[PDB]
Amino acid sequence: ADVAGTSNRDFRGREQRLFNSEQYNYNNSLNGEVSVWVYAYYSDGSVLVINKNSQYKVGISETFKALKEYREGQHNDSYDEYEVNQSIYYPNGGDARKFHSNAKPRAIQIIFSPSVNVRTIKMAKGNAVSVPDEYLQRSHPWEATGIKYRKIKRDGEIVGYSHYFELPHEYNSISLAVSGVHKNPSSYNVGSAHNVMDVFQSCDLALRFCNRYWAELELVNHYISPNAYPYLDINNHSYGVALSNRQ
Amino acid sequence: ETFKALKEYREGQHNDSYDEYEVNQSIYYPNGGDARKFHSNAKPRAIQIIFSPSVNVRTIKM
Amino acid sequence: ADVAGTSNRDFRGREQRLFNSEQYNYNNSLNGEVSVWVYAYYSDGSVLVINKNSQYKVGISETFKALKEYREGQHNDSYDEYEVNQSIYYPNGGDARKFHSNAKPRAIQIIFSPSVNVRTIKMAKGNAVSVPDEYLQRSHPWEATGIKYRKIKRDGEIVGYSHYFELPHEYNSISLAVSGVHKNPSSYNVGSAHNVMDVFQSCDLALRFCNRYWAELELVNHYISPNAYPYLDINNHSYGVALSNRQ
Amino acid sequence: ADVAGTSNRDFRGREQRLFNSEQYNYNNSLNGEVSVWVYAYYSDGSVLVINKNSQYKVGISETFKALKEYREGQHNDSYDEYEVNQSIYYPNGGDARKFHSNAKPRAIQIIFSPSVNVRTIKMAKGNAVSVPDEYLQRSHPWEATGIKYRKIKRDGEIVGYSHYFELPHEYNSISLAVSGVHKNPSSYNVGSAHNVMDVFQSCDLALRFCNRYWAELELVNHYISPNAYPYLDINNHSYGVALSNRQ
Ligand SMILES: Nc1nc2c(ncn2[C@@H]2O[C@H](COP(=O)(O)OP(=O)(O)OP(=O)(O)O)[C@@H](O)[C@H]2O)c(=O)[nH]1
Ligand SMILES: Nc1nc2c(ncn2[C@@H]2O[C@H](COP(=O)(O)OP(=O)(O)OP(=O)(O)O)[C@@H](O)[C@H]2O)c(=O)[nH]1
Ligand SMILES: Nc1nc2c(ncn2[C@@H]2O[C@H](COP(=O)(O)OP(=O)(O)OP(=O)(O)O)[C@@H](O)[C@H]2O)c(=O)[nH]1
Ligand SMILES: Nc1ncnc2c1ncn2[C@@H]1O[C@H](COP(=O)(O)OP(=O)(O)OP(=O)(O)O)[C@@H](O)[C@H]1O
Ligand SMILES: Nc1ncnc2c1ncn2[C@@H]1O[C@H](COP(=O)(O)OP(=O)(O)OP(=O)(O)O)[C@@H](O)[C@H]1O
Ligand SMILES: Nc1ncnc2c1ncn2[C@@H]1O[C@H](COP(=O)(O)OP(=O)(O)OP(=O)(O)O)[C@@H](O)[C@H]1O
Ligand SMILES: Nc1ccn([C@@H]2O[C@H](COP(=O)(O)OP(=O)(O)OP(=O)(O)O)[C@@H](O)[C@H]2O)c(=O)n1
Ligand SMILES: Nc1ccn([C@@H]2O[C@H](COP(=O)(O)OP(=O)(O)OP(=O)(O)O)[C@@H](O)[C@H]2O)c(=O)n1
Ligand SMILES: Nc1ccn([C@@H]2O[C@H](COP(=O)(O)OP(=O)(O)OP(=O)(O)O)[C@@H](O)[C@H]2O)c(=O)n1
Ligand SMILES: Nc1ccn([C@@H]2O[C@H](COP(=O)(O)OP(=O)(O)OP(=O)(O)O)[C@@H](O)[C@H]2O)c(=O)n1
Ligand SMILES: [Cl-]
Ligand SMILES: [Cl-]
Ligand SMILES: [Cl-]
Ligand SMILES: [Mg+2]
Ligand SMILES: [Mg+2]
Ligand SMILES: [Mg+2]
Ligand SMILES: [Mg+2]
Ligand SMILES: [Mg+2]
Ligand SMILES: [Mg+2]
Ligand SMILES: [Mg+2]
Description:
The structure is cut from a larger assembly and holds four copies of chain A. Chain A has 247 residues and is α+β, with helices and mostly antiparallel strands. Chain A has one domain. Bound molecules: guanosine-5'-triphosphate (3 copies), adenosine-5'-triphosphate (3 copies), cytidine-5'-triphosphate (4 copies), chloride ion (3 copies) and magnesium ion (7 copies). The site of one magnesium ion has 2 residues of chain D, from helix 2.
């Protein structure tokens, strides 16, 4: 046989490159996944991740209460935290024993898989009683925030998209939903009558994952990296795997 | 349902809830947790899916 | 001096081989130990080991209750488990909040040291109220189960004997005692009048060991291997050390 | 065929009677069980049963502490009960908050299977520090109490033997061991040299059972009756099954 790495007959090299290219391209087909992650960062350095993976479109919707830190199997000041919520829903509405709950997120990062179309991304960032813009009567139910997403890149390839915003002020008390649509450069509308019931089934088939990691390092090591997920850390370093035309 | 949601939960009884957080960490990534057991008895041993007879079987997706 | 490994004057090699042979043969003398282990395997992957080591003869006897899983320093549903025992002693006799106690053993392995005589092994596998065979009136107090023991082998040598049985069914609710006698190819009966009081003293001198390990791996690493004990794991792999005529 | 119940050719009737006779006689053979029960009765109406079943001989030995009532999975005043024991071991030796512990047995019943030889029964009824008769120096280690055992009878047959004694006084604070030997009308001594190692193995093979029932009714219904055990209740009623020459 030809010697490795010296000719066009290195079929192991050609198949390795095809194996990667096919994964990249499958994810972008209408048969592929589109995925979103919301990361809520807490002052103790822990991170709640919520992930949803589905065909055609995907999103996540959470209340103010649901994004607060919850330590499984530990004390959580649960009575005082009921009172904190009352005081956040209406000023002076509660009887809490603290000025600032350390369970409130200090920051949110939203990441989409590279199979999203960025122009379809929509976010409803509401106040603590789940209203998008001060009063229901004057609320558009979302903002199209695609222009703010940064490309997470590895070896020159877009491995995902990130929108990050800090919540450093006492008044940053939010509810949050986000949504994006899978790329579709074709003129076959996946929600047109021929396929609309498949998209209804996709609403039931979407898989969700939720967990609190103790540190960004642990999130990088045990969540992002093992699953070949995109990520951007506090030092602006990009994680992910480049696949298109690569061995 | 998530992996976590299908685990056994005994309402109003002890559920080893701290150890079970650690079991989940060890299931999400090998050697990722610090649990005090090899196998969680809260993990399902089996799943049965049943549909009503009004389903069309060719549309079922899992 | 002669060079190592090249002549009959490698006295270090001769002494190494004698050191091993003497241990093998001492254990088989009437001055040596005979040992039994009972392993009760639980559905959480943990393993109760009971070991007894004595001269002349050895055994272990346990109730249904004693073989149930007990987690030292943790919750054990101890009130519900009293009710589980009532329901196991007589059908519908208890008021438990579960159909199957996960503390019930899923399997038993009995292992004897290679100094046992296999034809002397006896087992009383009783029901949950400690009766060998349905009713006392019709019970022979034991079954001689030696024919069922497998040889645990390493490098061609018998390092011990194993009888394993699963308890996979709801009705497998047992009490258990086992017993074996140290080899004695001589015509000197160790229980004849000259030595019988020594065997009575051996009943008092027998050393017992009991502990729950969290996994078969941990049992292999920290119990079986450090002490040069025989074992057979779920994958049918044999552990032990061959000693006869070996360096 | 002949009609049932009218001739010597009712082979189903003959086999039924043989089936019962064989159980009766097997239990009395040297291959059969001999069994002892100790029942400790508490003032709350509950009953601790300890049972031992073995070939050749059988007994039970318990400390003062071990015979005290223990409610599995409930409060047991365990600190105060340590102090009660100190005050029972030596007058004014403890710092308990009660004059009389309700965990002390009010009565003991010892029952043997009908395969015991009554003349071999021995009892060591000690004081609370486990001394048979006031001081060790003057103690015979047992009393042969067979003459006091009553025959428990059903349909004319001895189904077992009972010795009962109340402990109604404040000073009735006891430790207790009992022992009996299986019948052997032969001149083959089961402990002579030919078989002595089998009797040593029987010491390891003896099966034990222990449990606290909440009432004598529950003991009758769920312990005595289902297992065809002999018993004598507080009303002097005999329980058991007659088997010899019976359908
Ligand atoms: N492309 C490129 N890579 C370099 C150069 N110097 C060092 N590198 C390293 O080499 C790696 C890329 O190597 P290759 O994948 O073999 O080169 P390629 O440009 O992808 O070409 P093909 O894989 O043959 O299509 C990068 O990760 C760089 O860190 C350079 O001049 N050009
Ligand atoms: N006996 C034997 N062992 C082999 C052979 N080939 C590889 N081995 C390995 O060598 C090991 C045994 O080596 P030795 O103990 O030196 O050979 P031996 O047969 O015991 O002979 P002595 O120790 O000199 O009595 C085994 O564990 C084998 O895995 C072979 O042909 N014969
Ligand atoms: N033996 C006997 N039993 C009676 C009499 N009257 C009523 N019985 C009842 O009948 C039962 C015994 O019946 P059987 O077992 O048929 O009589 P048996 O004397 O044992 O005779 P075989 O069984 O034929 O050997 C007892 O439980 C009594 O309650 C009587 O006069 N004699
Ligand atoms: N020394 C080099 N000269 C020319 N091209 C290079 C060199 N090193 C890498 N490249 C190529 O340039 C492209 C971009 O790779 P690069 O590693 O710069 O991007 P990245 O990992 O997305 O971002 P960065 O490394 O800047 O964080 C890839 O195709 C890569 O192989
Ligand atoms: N390649 C070989 N050819 C001949 N004899 C061998 C070879 N390898 C090992 N032996 C010898 O054969 C005997 C049996 O050793 P072996 O390792 O097969 O037994 P074991 O460890 O009890 O079982 P196994 O390895 O099959 O689980 C030993 O004396 C050993 O030294
Ligand atoms: N009416 C009767 N006349 C004659 N013999 C009887 C009668 N009833 C029973 N028997 C027989 O007398 C024997 C003794 O039975 P019985 O029921 O009197 O003894 P038990 O059950 O040990 O004691 P008890 O019934 O007095 O508590 C048995 O063989 C039985 O069949
Ligand atoms: N504003 C508050 C906060 C707490 N408490 C009281 O202090 C007790 C403990 O507080 P909690 O907030 O429930 O904290 P933990 O019990 O420590 O935590 P958890 O409930 O999560 O286990 C409560 O039962 C409640 O009586 C209160 O009166 N008023
Ligand atoms: N891997 C583990 C498991 C438990 N624990 C400790 O043991 C205590 C009790 O364990 P937990 O798993 O919370 O069980 P329970 O309290 O019995 O059950 P529950 O929490 O469901 O009421 C915990 O607070 C925790 O301190 C631990 O340190 N490490
Ligand atoms: N069949 C049952 C089981 C439990 N319980 C009640 O629930 C309480 C807790 O149950 P238990 O079985 O004792 O479990 P734990 O307290 O969790 O474990 P442990 O006792 O081993 O520490 C008990 O006090 C008892 O009141 C009950 O009424 N009936
Ligand atoms: N003579 C006694 C008896 C009890 N106590 C105290 O009261 C507490 C409770 O008593 P205890 O006898 O242990 O009863 P419970 O806790 O009710 O029962 P258990 O321990 O069996 O669960 C103990 O920790 C001990 O401090 C004491 O000081 N002196
Ligand atoms: Cl497509
Ligand atoms: Cl010897
Ligand atoms: Cl016989
Ligand atoms: Mg807990
Ligand atoms: Mg609380
Ligand atoms: Mg780079
Ligand atoms: Mg081998
Ligand atoms: Mg409890
Ligand atoms: Mg206490
Ligand atoms: Mg009668």
